[PDB]
Design a protein around this ligand. Structure first.
Ligand SMILES: [Cl-]
Ligand SMILES: [Cl-]
Ligand SMILES: [Mg+2]
Ligand SMILES: [Mg+2]
Lengths: 396, 396
């Protein structure tokens, strides 16, 4: 068939419009090049690009047949010769996630302004969650080289408007993420284990102060780890098991891991904490990888030292690389989630580095930042919706 | 904010509508629950569900501000109290792919009719390819238990209308496919290797006749393999390397494998053919797994026997299971592609079994069937679009 014709149906949605249009078109000599339909809040748009002989596209039959059928039932239709029109839309370059509790119109409005200000076309908006936070995705087409300035502008909007805003690559490769690592303390697990260990020694305040210093990036991780573990010298080793029994997962942690298993992620933890605590939990959560430090014990008592090599800032990244290589996963398809300056090198080496309720030092260099205390918001950044999570959980 | 309000903007698309609406809403006390926007063929739909105090939803300010701003620039808007309206649409249960060259309106119309006849709601239609075949996706919501009758009805439409139509599970788990196996002969590779081996012995016609019998499911695979290989007794073993040098990939095979690597699939071949031919190629294509039979050689000459165990119908499925277990992939997330009755058990055990230009015996029990001679149409069934393939290839 020589020429192209475009038919556009819009109006209040009704059952059977789709079948009716194509059945009408089948009386004329029509082959399909592209069909796009959606219904949003009971508004239908059905756009159909077809080719037929110049013969049929130029004679009044096709028009009257389509116009009559669509208008009888109360919808509107347009028909027009195309020829230079695109057959099929381009893929979006990027996708932007906005999470908030609440998301004000002012905040979403500020996101749309920076987007427009940078020449970025909004291709599609949809909802990705109503719980535990309101979540919205904008798929976008970003002019080459603008993607740095876009994150920068949307990071300012994020801090000024009290929403999380993550800009990510939406190409085929970059978005088949297949491996994830979590930091443990204040990421996967609530609070700081080394503080729970220090309270047994009557030293919580000293250890808490040094931990907060080190997590904000003010102190060398290794020196800080040694001063803090030193505080535990003389505790009986039974303390490890007691503190392991007290640990609470971050809210949403179980849904996060269970959803990531459904997706076939390899799953791991990289910690500056202690293996005898973390393994207990990592076996329970069926994780595929653990890197941790190790407490020194003599005669069933903690010496206050660790048994090197110390997992430090560089060490976390080294651990992720080791895991990615054992698993067969290129670094571009890896994800890392952490809260502390401890995590900066790991987050930067990962394909996507997510700062979870993080100190400013990590937040400043992270690909994306999450501010709400629900570890499952990570799933929204991995392209999963709340409805998808709930359906899959309800099957069992 | 106590109550919910729904704002629906439609009309001819213009730049800056999105920012304008939210900036207008920010003057009233508004928080966002859901936003859906798309533009199809220059038609905009922007649906916004918000909550605000009963105070603001009941007074004329919000209405006039929104109506005035949207109508000034030439679009239409609706505003209405909601309260019982859904916050966020449910996920689609299933997705249907329709591929054709051409796709007539009559064919697509027949698909829409069977869908409607079974109570299945069409949630979204879009294009997934313009090349090498026209491809269209319909995401759908299928009433529980209707999904068997739907495939059945759409298989009849497929054979009567000359389109491929595949119905697949669109839930989170079922659609994170992570492992694929291909049959070799007439699937990954053009033609039948055993026929190319027989032509060297002057026996092509005899071997071709038996191969077609066995691939249609008329003969025991093992007996047929032995009668055919017997025909090669006395060929020098150099013949293996010659036939390996003559092999041509199915058109689209390279794009298929290269795209599957980008997605992180584990990739393998399960064949009733011969390892000394298949390994050469499998190393070149960097596949992670090969199962094949093995020709017996004495003094550099083919005896006309194979060295057991024979990979038969049951054997192909056994091989896929072995590969899935080594790779850590549950069978529900595996894919298998074949053409012959040889492949029936493998296709049935796979999470998704795809018949590629297949004999009727395989086509009849396959989850999905492809009729066009482009192995890349497999990618469309795995949720990839042509534009996505082309973008990712153009980056390098
Ligand atoms: Cl740590
Ligand atoms: Cl075979
Ligand atoms: Mg931490
Ligand atoms: Mg075959």
């Amino acid at each position: 068939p020589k020429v192209s014709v475009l038919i556009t149906v819009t109006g209040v949605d009704q059952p059977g419009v789709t079948a009716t249009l194509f059945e009408v078109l089948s009386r004329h000599g029509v082959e399909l090049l592209n069909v796009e339909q959606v219904v949003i809040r009971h508004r239908l748009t059905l756009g159909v690009l077809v080719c037929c002989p110049a013969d049929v596209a130029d004679g009044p039959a096709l028009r009257h047949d389509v116009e009559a059928a669509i208008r009888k039932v109360g919808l509107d239709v347009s028909i027009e010769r195309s020829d230079d029109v695109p057959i099929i839309r381009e893929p979006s370059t990027h996708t932007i996630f906005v999470l908030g509790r609440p998301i004000t119109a002012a905040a979403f409005g500020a996101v749309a302004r920076e987007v427009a200000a940078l020449g970025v076309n909004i291709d599609l908006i949809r909802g990705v969650s109503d719980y535990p936070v309101i979540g919205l995705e904008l798929r976008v087409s970003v002019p080459p080289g603008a993607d740095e300035a876009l994150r920068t502008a949307l990071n300012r909007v994020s801090s000024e408007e009290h929403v999380d805003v993550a800009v990510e690559d939406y190409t085929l490769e970059r978005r088949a993420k297949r491996l994830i690592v979590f930091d443990v303390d204040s990421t996967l697990v609530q609070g700081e284990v080394i503080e729970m260990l220090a309270a047994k020694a009557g030293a919580e305040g000293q250890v808490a102060a040094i931990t907060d210093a080190a997590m904000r990036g003010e102190l060398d991780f290794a020196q800080s780890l040694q001063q803090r573990v030193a505080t535990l010298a003389g505790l009986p080793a039974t303390v490890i098991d007691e503190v392991a029994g007290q640990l609470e997962l971050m809210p949403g942690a179980r849904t996060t891991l269970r959803t990531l298993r459904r997706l076939g992620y390899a799953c791991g933890v990289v910690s500056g904490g202690f293996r005898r605590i973390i393994e207990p939990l990592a076996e329970e959560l069926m994780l595929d990888y653990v890197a941790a430090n190790e407490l020194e014990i003599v005669d069933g008592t903690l010496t206050g030292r660790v048994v090197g090599p110390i997992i430090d800032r560089a060490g976390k990244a080294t651990a992720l690389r080791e895991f990615a290589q054992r698993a067969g996963v290129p670094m571009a398809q890896t994800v890392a989630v952490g809260d502390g300056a401890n995590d900066i090198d790991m987050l930067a080496a990962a394909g996507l580095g997510i700062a979870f309720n993080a100190k400013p030092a990590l937040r400043e260099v992270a690909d994306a930042s999450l501010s709400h205390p629900y570890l499952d918001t990570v799933l929204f950044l991995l392209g999963v919706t709340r409805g998808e999570i709930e359906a899959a959980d309800a099957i069992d």
